Write a structure and sequence with these properties.
heteropentamer, A: about 120 residues, mainly beta, Immunoglobulin-like, six-stranded mixed beta sheet, about 0% helix, B: about 575 residues, Jelly Rolls, Alpha-Beta Plaits, 3 domains, eight-stranded mixed beta sheet, elongated, binds 2-acetamido-2-deoxy-beta-D-glucopyranose, Spike protein S1 (chains B, C, D), viral protein/immune system, SARS-CoV-2, VIRAL PROTEIN-IMMUNE SYSTEM complex
Chain lengths: ~120, ~575, ~575, ~575, ~120
């Protein structure tokens, strides 16, 4: 029962910055691949980025050059530093764990930016 | 209404020999001067047929009573009768011979045949009373007291009398063959004048077909209808009945046999050869002209000592399943697997087994089983099977062309769909190449449809491999969720860990027997073997085509199999 | 625009001989000094080809009118034209030759070819009004009076002219072969200078392929386009046309023939042999070198004189159908079975026939037919078929793997469902064992699910065999009721009683004929036979693989059958 | 905890010869006095195996450092060890040999074995520090310094020691074979006494299977664990270690080979023959007793010159697109379509294909292509896709539920927008009813919004159907104009007129190649030929099929084909 | 190249009359429907009138009883008879050829009516 702890969103004015974090507390057999997915009310799931632990980047063009992902090997955590926000980018996000057996999901982080 | 007679007192049986009698025409095709071999249900030659008096006087006082015991009906009946006074009138056929089950009645009065198929409530001593009229005496009036009531009649047949009028040693021998095959009740018959022969004549007479009745019911037992000329209310001292039952009947039981029939020039079967009677008859049948292997006694089943139980419940009743890609694969071993809970639950929409019948899963014994679990749409359920193509069959989960196992899938609208859409499951529309069977690629590398490299950034002609699965509870059946698990069975030359819920039996040795060691079934005799099986050896094949030696699973002892065939 | 021409008056046909003409290259392979046998659409050797004058002057006054008939196009056409003044200009191909259907137009003016496929509205008499201009007279200007309008053009093609310029006895022979195979219009052509031969010359010239047009239309008829040099408004007394139609065209029709073609060293077909022309040519084709089927004229059909109509109405349109337990099958015999009513009704959701095609039941004759009439859920309808499993296929109604018959079923939502639920239809989920096919169990014994006996009383691990089905009009497709009839047809060596709606014919003795006796169809000759058939015998087989003798169903005379082949 | 050692310095590799060693039992059956051919992962005979000293003295000073490189694991490993005092203790297997991946550890201490499957933090130099007790010296106490941390273990196994106690020239040879197949780690082992042989001895010993651990981790890398008798803190000048590493271990790699194994009368593998070693071994394997086609180099594909192109430029590069009522439906046929242009160009915002994948357009051939070109605002170009609604999906363009074809849209600000606004594109908001398939309604009748008729005159509740769109260069993206083309592809049972471009390659003569000439595929060598093909006859043929010569499509030269020498 | 020739406009005092002409050349298949449209500076395209091949007249409520259209089948041309002029009619006019696809316009006729 891999649990994905997500935290670090909220309400921020246009041009601000936030720092999300997702932590996998479960088994996580052998390599993983940690991803972040976007969903605004009325649309589908849009994956922001599915960077693996080793490599492969996998950045999307939606917010090109604005968000970044940091990997912590000691605790095997992932942080989403989101800078230069715009009301379009705002949505609910879910962290994604590919794993060796099955893929899991988070419980959600609200991100809102407007003026 | 029926009338109660006396107790039958269980007379001891009496037998007589049937000198090549009861040969009927198996087909309706004219054959002339030809020897045709037919494998059908025939009365064996020189067989012991059981013979009963119509009236038997055994008591010291001189009691006269019907001899009409309920006789079994094993794959047809040859019924012969030697009589002169029409004291035999017909038969009843059935299993329980009461209102619970359907029954057949055939009765022949002075005019015609009555054939009925109804739920007759037959009495213990069914029969027909015969009284002559006061002036004519040419015909004889019959009151039927065979059944108390009749219900659910589905057949009625009337025709010319099967049994003619017999109205003083002019006895007649009438032979009949009654068969029940494929819901059809066939009557063959032949009638011949007899003279001075108490038992069955010696000679040959062919039995021509009379009728083929569509009865479509089950028969296990049958009885005989007899005509009483005396009175049940007042039994006379003697001569009230018919000469103390000089007239009588023979009953024999047909068996599956091959007969060689000789049609003469005019098309009549003038001679027959029973292939299983004597070695000379065997020679005649093999040469088609007129001029051995030891069987197993019983079945023994021998399995390992395993008391564990399987997590089949957890796999099939899990709260969450993996996506189509990155499908979860669990190994199940060291447990006894009951597939009846699975096969007979009827809660699965799709259940296909390849390389094994789904009803024999409970019997076989496997080294290991692998459970693959995920969720799909309906139109893609057809894609989980060997030899198929498609985006799942080529990019997500490929079953090999030699797949052996069972794919199971069932509806999951109310488990996996949510009103605004369940986007927790995905697939890959794109890949550089098709998959290998059971290979699971989980890479998320951005596709490169164009000529320019994407470098892990999806722009134009650059797409992320995975697209979400749209689950809504209002979706059509093709777009609805289905939870699917593929159970792949491994049947290898290895000791089995996942078993069936079969009970091992005692080991019977030095005797030809049906055996089943660790799923290997066969027939043969077993002996102690001095063969030097090392602690790890399980099976043995010195000839590489016949398992000469095996290890018993319960007790680790080498028993070598000789074929009890000699 | 088109111009209406005088009546053709239906000139009588005139024929001539085609001495080994019309041989084209069937393939596109280079063969050198080899003899190849090709089975293809060729014009038979020494055939009669019908020839028409371009302009015929047959009236007493001297009227000159084009002979431009509409001719059939049956499996290709060989069109030969002997001319000297380019009076023939092209062709039109199609079925209706109007705006309703698509048509193909090929025309040749002085410059190039015009190939079109459009919905041309052809007039009665298409042509090209051809006029010379005043000074050079090298070329001829053409006015197309072929079609009123063209719409939905789906093809356009131009190339070097099919016919060369012919601008005084230098007659030329232009031979063309037109085929329409697999939506491709194939044109082969050859041009040869000719001298002093009025009709088709004697010799050999192979037709090289010219064009392959992916036309993809249906062609049944074709016509010819002619050049009108004279003026329609003022027809001259004489010489206004071209020498009273000295030019002519011959038409022959291709047929499927086997030819032996002889390719020389350069690869050009030098000679050909028509294998079906003469016994010598047949021998040449048999040896592959250049150096007993008596047919049935008529067909004899004999059926019994039965006027009854089978009671399908009391089965399919019955007001009530029993539960899935109690067999209510209706037996149909001694009646005429019109099956087109059922299979052309298109109201039954399942038509699944095994052993017999559903369109030939109207021709076959059966000893009897059994109609099972029951109501079953839709998702379980797929369980009524041979070789299947499931609660219905195992615990209610079993089908043997060798079924010969048809399962038919339709929706019964508005007939069998009520608002409150119809629990009069009952089902089993539990039995001690599976059935034999056509076994019919109506027992109500309570089954023992546990180890303790039930003794006919429900309780713990004791259940009634009977559950009820909630048939409601709001149920889905999977749960609505379905009315199902299983028609089992019996084909045995016995006389038929449910013969279909055929028409028995008269008798032709001692002549070769296709014959049908009570359902046995074959080919042969019949003679009077002195054989005697026993009343139960209908056929005869002295050799056991061919029916030598037969009984006529109408007259009881026994007729023997001899093979037709001499 | 781990201890850091000195740099390995990358000692140059040294090899030795393996005289028929490493043969194990492939299957678990008893075979006696039989020759069996098995194809499996075997170490090839007389192979070069790499040999490493446990302790190597190579420095000038006399440094004693272990030689324990991390070696590959390619489809199995044959690990032999010749030693005297138990310096080799076990092995570590894994891909990264760190915490990122799972790892397998096998260790043999003085008492038992330890088999663990965990993500150990293996150091650079794992080893066991072995020290004897001060009084007994019978056994050796071992300190493990091979991993830093053990966590998330998924396996544990303990049994009798793999390596027996070796506690002075009685060297012993211990041979192991490690395989990783189907999630199973299989170990085969054999122990022999060796005398006066420095390298692997000459002879035959079969390896009996030891363990068959079920383990999912992939290995592809491994290392040997050794024991230090000396001290890492204080390294002695000499003899502190064990005699400068006379003992050694040899590593070879298994390969897929076919062996002929000879099971003697007692069932042990006495001899083996490697079928791929020498020609005589090939003969022995072919006769199953102890007593050739040239491959093609590359593939060649040649298709004729690409000439006809679609007028996609007249559609996509057109100057003016029509209104949203009169779509420029244009028919496309009889020409070659290159869809790589519009795909790789990627100048189109939307590119959606339904019923066909967008990358295989160049491979499919279509009967017809229909192009509809027009101009539409941003949001509405998003609307065009099957099964959807809206003003345009219901009132201007009718799009079927099943639609095979591609919708293609691009932004058109700089082409269709003017400063004052382009009102030349008109859109409807009102119609009486929704559309039917592909209806191009251009009617201008005034719609009756109220109950009174309009009679072609506007007023109260009367409106013109056509409103104007204010296309301006300052408009937002949603209101900006987009030029859109929908291409509907027709795939039916007719010959194709629109085909993708065929990609031919270069020509290689006088070489054995795979060739594809206009659909004719084969393998062979091609030479210039002096044959005389006709203008047609693309490919020649010999006496019995088997095409000898072909004609190159691009260059009319005739290339004759000779089968590749075999 | 389908061309719509424009003629017949200009400056006219209030109450005057003119006769504009729409001339069609090019493909112009048999089923055409020719109309006139009004545009004043600051407004959009206003439907003045249309006639189809049926020869029916459809006129707007703006100009009830003032404009008229006549057809010429021989040349397939159109004429606006423009009578009873008011200063609210001051606007440039254009033809519109419905045809079947790719509707074509003209180059225009200036209409001015003032006193
Ligand atoms: C081991 O398991 C722990 C707890 O489930 C987890 O945090 C860690 O990522 C796993 N892998 C390690 C420690 O390498
Ligand atoms: C899942 O639960 C249902 C509850 O009705 C039960 O009938 C079924 O047997 C369970 N599945 C397994 C595999 O045990
Ligand atoms: C069960 O099997 C084991 C090993 O096969 C054996 O040692 C034991 O005696 C058996 N016990 C019984 C009760 O059969
Ligand atoms: C049953 O009645 C319907 C009435 O619509 C008719 O169409 C159909 O042919 C009938 N079928 C039979 C077998 O009578
Ligand atoms: C009709 O059938 C009867 C039945 O015996 C037969 O006698 C009669 O000849 C038949 N009629 C014809 C015309 O065959
Ligand atoms: C035509 O379209 C092509 C598509 O490849 C593209 O190069 C360009 O946009 C256009 N060029 C011209 C000259 O119209
Ligand atoms: C086909 O194209 C090639 C290269 O453009 C040219 O050399 C060759 O002549 C062409 N084919 C013909 C028949 O001209």
């Amino acid at each position: 029962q891999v649990q994905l702890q997500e935290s670090g969103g909220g309400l921020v004015q246009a041009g601000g910055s936030l720092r999300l974090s997702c932590a996998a507390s479960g088994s996580i057999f052998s390599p993983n691949t940690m991803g972040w997915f976007r969903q605004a009310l009325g649309k589908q799931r849009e994956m922001v980025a599915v960077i693996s632990s080793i490599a492969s980047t996998q950045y999307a063009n939606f917010v090109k050059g604005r968000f970044t992902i940091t990997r912590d090997n000691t605790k095997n955590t992932v942080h989403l530093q989101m800078n230069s926000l715009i009301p379009e980018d705002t949505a609910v996000y879910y962290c994604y764990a590919v794993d060796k057996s099955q893929d899991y999901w988070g419980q959600g982080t609200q991100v809102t930016v407007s003026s | 209404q029926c009338v109660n007679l006396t107790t039958r007192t269980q007379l001891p049986p009496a037998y007589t020999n049937s000198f090549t009698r009861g040969v009927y025409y198996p087909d309706k095709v004219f054959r002339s001067s030809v020897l045709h071999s037919t494998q059908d249900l025939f009365l064996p030659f020189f067989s012991n047929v059981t013979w009963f008096h119509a009236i038997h006087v055994s008591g010291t006082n001189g009691t006269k009573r019907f001899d009409n015991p309920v006789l079994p009906f094993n794959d047809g009946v040859y019924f012969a009768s030697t009589e002169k006074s029409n004291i035999i009138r017909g038969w009843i056929f059935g299993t329980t011979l009461d209102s619970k089950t359907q029954s057949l009645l055939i009765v022949n009065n002075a005019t015609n045949v009555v054939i009925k198929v109804c739920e007759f409530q037959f009495c213990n001593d069914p029969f027909l009373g015969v009284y002559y009229h006061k002036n004519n005496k040419s015909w004889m009036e019959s009151e039927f007291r065979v059944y108390s009531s009749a219900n659910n009649c589905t057949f009625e047949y009337v025709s010319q009398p099967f049994l003619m009028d017999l109205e003083g040693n002019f006895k007649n021998l009438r032979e009949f063959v009654f068969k029940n095959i494929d819901g059809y009740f066939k009557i063959y018959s032949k009638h011949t004048p007899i003279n001075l022969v108490r038992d069955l004549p010696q000679g040959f007479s062919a039995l021509e077909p009379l009728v083929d009745l569509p009865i479509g019911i089950n028969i296990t037992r049958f009885q005989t209808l007899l005509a009483l000329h005396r009175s049940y209310l007042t039994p006379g001292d003697s001569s009230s009945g018919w000469t103390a039952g000089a007239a009588a009947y023979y009953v024999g039981y047909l068996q599956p046999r091959t007969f060689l029939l000789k049609y003469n020039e005019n098309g009549t079967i003038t001679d027959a050869v029973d292939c299983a009677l004597d070695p000379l008859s065997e020679t005649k049948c093999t040469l088609k002209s007129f001029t051995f292997r030891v069987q197993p006694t019983e079945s023994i089943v021998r399995f390992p000592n395993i008391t564990n139980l399987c997590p089949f419940g957890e796999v099939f009743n899990a709260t969450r399943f993996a996506s189509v890609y990155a499908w979860n694969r669990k190994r199940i071993s060291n447990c006894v697997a009951d597939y009846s809970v699975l096969y007979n639950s009827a809660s699965f929409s799709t259940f296909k087994c390849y390389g094994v019948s789904p009803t024999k899963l409970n019997d076989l014994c496997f080294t290991n089983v692998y459970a693959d679990s995920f969720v799909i749409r309906g139109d893609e359920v057809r894609q989980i099977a060997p030899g198929q193509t498609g985006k799942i069959a080529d990019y997500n989960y490929k079953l090999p062309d030699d797949f052996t196992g069972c794919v199971i899938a069932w509806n999951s609208n109310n488990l996996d769909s949510k009103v605004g859409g369940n986007y927790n499951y995905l697939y890959r529309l794109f890949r550089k190449s098709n998959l290998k069977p059971f290979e699971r690629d989980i890479s998320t590398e951005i596709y490169q449809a164009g000529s320019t490299p994407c470098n892990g950034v999806e722009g134009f002609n650059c797409y992320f491999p995975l697209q979400s699965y749209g689950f809504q509870p209002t979706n059509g059946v093709g777009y609805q969720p289905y939870r699917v698990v593929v159970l792949s069975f491994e049947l290898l030359h290895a000791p089995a860990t996942v078993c069936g819920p079969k009970k091992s039996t005692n080991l019977v040795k030095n005797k030809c027997v049906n055996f089943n060691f660790n799923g290997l079934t066969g027939t043969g005799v077993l002996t102690e073997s001095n063969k030097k099986f090392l602690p790890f050896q399980q099976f043995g094949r010195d000839i590489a085509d016949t398992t000469d030696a095996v290890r018993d699973p319960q007790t680790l002892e080498i028993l070598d199999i000789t074929p009890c065939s000699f």
